[PDB]
Amino acid sequence: TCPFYKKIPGTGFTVDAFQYGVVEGCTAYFLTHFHSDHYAGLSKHFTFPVYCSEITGNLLKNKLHVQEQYIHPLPLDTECIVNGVKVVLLDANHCPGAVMILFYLPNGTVILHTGDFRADPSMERSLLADQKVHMLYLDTTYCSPEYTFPSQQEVIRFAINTAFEAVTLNPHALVVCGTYSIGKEKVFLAIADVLGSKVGMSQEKYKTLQCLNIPEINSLITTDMCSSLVHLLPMMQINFKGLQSHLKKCGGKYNQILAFRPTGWTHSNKFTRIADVIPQTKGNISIYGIPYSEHSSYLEMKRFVQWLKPQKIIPTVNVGTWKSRSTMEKYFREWKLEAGY
Ligand code: NI
């Protein structure tokens, strides 16, 4: 059964609610982004209207085989009427295709659902500038001050410099990058660009990337692993065993691996600056865990919410324990007293 924080009152709408069977009274199902925790349930057998971005719609069609007649892509930054209600989709600064949804309810209430997001000051000059929001359904993944991590630009600088240095010292090193979902593609695209190589991967991953409207993509990726000195592998193979196993396959072309494991936040952020990060090493294999986040840091979230000044906040992450829910409400009240709304 569909929880309350996935329903939009006064409409026939749900958001990210595909794993509960038929939702009583739902005439349109919104999907914020193509991550499995949110799409859980969709397939070729789905027969209700799905509203989403163009990129999400390409993924639904090609990866889940949802029939074309049930896919409803909307452009961003544009007022659209769906089942007699005005909506807008806004870029969430999460993974490719990810959106926030503004709903202009028939009774005059305005609701913003963030989906998954990485808050940014650029959002203060979207269509949000204009107006009041009565209810914010907020991605609270990192809603506590201990959650600190660098900018994406700093993390990419570190990865580019690390890989360019290694391969310049040893032209026979291979670079490997772990993946498990869409998102974080800049990690492997930036490294391949500094090395003058395409990125090699499986046919399944290549298909996924071909759905993302990335300009000049045919110039950047390939399924010919042997022609490539940046390889992608599933995230679970990014360990000393899995990497040794991979180096055997390459046929004595390479004599070293340098690997990257992009993560979310980890507790070594509480001590170590991005510059100071060191790898785990066994023999001719080195592995770097790098904190490339696509969710808001505490400070980013606080800034966005103190700017928006919503009337009420409904968290959509960390809602399962009394202690979590209690801690989040304390922070929402400080923010409100500090800023005066
Ligand atoms: Ni997500």
From Swiss-Prot:
Superkingdom of the organism of origin: Eukaryota
Known tissue expression: Expressed in brain, heart, kidney, liver, pancreas, placenta and skeletal muscle.
Localization terms from the record: Nucleus
Effect of D139N: Impaired nuclear focus formation, reduced interaction with PIAS and increased sensitivity to cisplatin
Induction: During mitosis. The mRNA encoding this protein contains an internal ribosome entry site (IRES) in its 5'-UTR. This 5'-UTR generally suppresses translation while specifically promoting expression during mitosis, when cap-dependent translation may be impaired.
Primary role: May be required for DNA interstrand cross-link repair. Also required for checkpoint mediated cell cycle arrest in early prophase in response to mitotic spindle poisons. Possesses beta-lactamase activity, catalyzing the hydrolysis of penicillin G and nitrocefin. Exhibits no activity towards other beta-lactam antibiotic classes including cephalosporins (cefotaxime) and carbapenems (imipenem).
Family that this chain belongs to: Belongs to the DNA repair metallo-beta-lactamase (DRMBL) family.
Protein name, as recorded: DNA cross-link repair 1A protein
Organism of provenance: Homo sapiens (Human)
Gene: DCLRE1A
